Design a protein around this ligand. Structure first.
Ligand SMILES: O=C(O)CC[C@H](C(=O)O)[C@@H](O)C(=O)O
Ligand SMILES: O=C(O)CC[C@H](C(=O)O)[C@@H](O)C(=O)O
Ligand SMILES: [Mn+2]
Ligand SMILES: [Mn+2]
Lengths: 329, 329
């Protein structure tokens, strides 16, 4: 079997992960799911958002499936569950796919996931505060390789977004991205972070594999979600060398917790990316979602009157259909 | 008289500045304009993009009016004309107003203009590249004061955009922004840089005075231009303690240089901000622009068949009308 660690978190996390897990269970019985707590509650007890013993099991697992965690600004000493898991598990590539569910068109973003302004070197001293945007040869080389694999697989190109005129680290990063994409026969268009925002809202589908430094990726990937029903359908994967973690790009939405109306699509499509990573069949889930969405009642965030459970049940419906065929004939 | 230094630059710079200067001359005869070269041509000769002698006159001038300069990525040692002028003249506040010309609704952005990732400390050493995002008490205090004056004058509030969870310097910056806006009775809503991008494209007009660190401001202010005809109509001012500089937010658009079809509105509205700064009457220019735009033929970037000259002539038309009245009756 495959061992998958599951961290539902809080807010709508549990609800959408219930949805995703149930969809996964409907496409394969080859995955054992083990659940773990994490977040503020665990921080309160042990001073970390994930227990050391739980963290050890998690890294021995084959993949991780993650919901959403509330990160409060007013909790001294708290570090993000997801940032913690990203660093602890070596998760250097963050892939976000923003889908137009009708057409199957995709905005594909590769966000470097381990350095940049997230590296963690920061200080206040004598009324001067500082943060160090770090780019390393190792960080840039592997995030570039990863982006070229995505471009190769899609018979596509890379759009490297930066601000090289102002940032030494982006001049560096750009040169390395160009080296490795040369070696591998991939085109690299470049784009400046400010003007690209305009291009991203106006001409969404013409950018291939978008690549960028961590914080720029964080910004651009939220921005790209405007081209989808709601941020509620957008999935992602965080990849490292021996393990990966999958989470919807939405967050806790505590406002709507427990009201039975959260959108499980993003988590479901994330369980899809998880199956791909394991060598199982995520294309099934994707087809199920496309198909349910033609005439299915959608959740309120997408302008519909449907409940979470209705959407889950409906997608499982489409799966059972595709599944009961022999490759589709 | 007022002495105004004018730096048309290259590309469409000269064309739109010709437009702006002609509009200024139609509302006041109290401004003497002196022209100066700057950019790559001057860099080629003297190794700086502005001559030291020219720079000295410029700082003795009352204000500066600036077009657009091409900053090529492949010119070793070249620093931006505008970045150079920003640092040399002490221009710490950058105000960008994105207007909906029909309604007179405005997205108002205050971009800190002297530090952050623009401070200039960067290095490559041993396959590690670095840039230092610097926030100082002095930088944050004065950019906050400036933002509160804009909120006070509009009977409005501040939206401070940041990524405090990840950036020490934003935790600092946020506390100082909150201090000074408390002292002055201004509300401070806050927003996270990633999720705010969604809010900015979806709910543009409900954010009051948006305030942020330099690079974040650079990004957000380009993004905000999607809510306007084209980036072509958007103006700005760069303010310091003894002088200010005004430029359209668009750039060189060399693609369309010399073709007689550039949009002079952004420069014109920037000449408006310049008149306000001098205590002259920029509201005139703004009314002229609103009025011309009701039925006037617009330039191709706004979906029309008009030439630069037509729009300039038309706005001067509206000015002459408003001007020939006694405060409007
Ligand atoms: O809880 C946090 O501060 C992390 C949020 C996290 C990030 O990458 O910054 C989230 O914004 C995301 O895009 O994954
Ligand atoms: O020529 C340059 O690199 C400066 C461009 C300048 C900036 O603030 O980065 C421009 O993008 C702007 O928004 O003013
Ligand atoms: Mn984010
Ligand atoms: Mn810019």
């Amino acid at each position: 079997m495959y061992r998958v660690a599951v961290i539902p978190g809080d807010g709508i996390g549990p609800e959408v992960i219930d949805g995703a897990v149930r969809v996964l269970k409907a496409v394969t019985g080859r995955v054992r799911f083990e659940y773990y707590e994490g977040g503020v509650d665990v921080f309160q007890e042990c001073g970390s958002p994930i227990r050391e013993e739980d963290l050890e099991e998690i890294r021995r697992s084959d993949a991780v499936l993650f919901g959403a965690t509330t990160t409060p600004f007013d909790l001294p000493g708290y570090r993000s569950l997801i940032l913690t898991l990203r660093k602890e598990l070596g998760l250097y590539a963050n892939l976000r796919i923003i889908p137009d569910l009708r057409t199957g068109r995709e905005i594909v973003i590769v966000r470097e996931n381990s350095e940049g302004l997230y590296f963690g070197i920061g200080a206040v001293v004598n009324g001067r505060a500082v943060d160090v945007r770090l780019i390393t040869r190792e960080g840039a080389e592997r995030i570039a390789r990863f982006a070229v694999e995505q471009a190769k697989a899609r018979g596509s190109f890379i759009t490297f977004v930066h601000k090289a005129n102002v940032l030494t680290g982006d001049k560096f990063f750009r040169r390395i991205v160009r080296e490795v994409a040369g070696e591998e026969g991939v085109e690299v268009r470049d784009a400046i972070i400010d003007s690209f925002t305009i291009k991203l809202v106006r001409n969404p589908w013409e950018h291939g594999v978008i690549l960028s430094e961590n914080l720029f990726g964080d910004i651009l990937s939220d921005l790209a979600t405007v081209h989808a029903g709601s941020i509620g359908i957008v999935p992602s994967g965080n990849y490292g060398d021996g393990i990966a973690l999958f989470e919807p790009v939405h967050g806790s939405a505590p406002d709507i917790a427990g009201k039975g109306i959260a959108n499980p699509i993003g988590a479901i499509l994330s369980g899809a990316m998880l199956l791909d990573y394991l060598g199982l069949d995520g294309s099934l889930i994707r087809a199920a979602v496309r198909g349910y969405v033609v005439n299915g009642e959608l959740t309120p965030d997408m302008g519909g009157r449907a409940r979470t459970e209705d959407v889950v049940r409906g997608i499982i419906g489409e799966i059972e259909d595709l599944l009961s065929m022999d490759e589709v004939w």
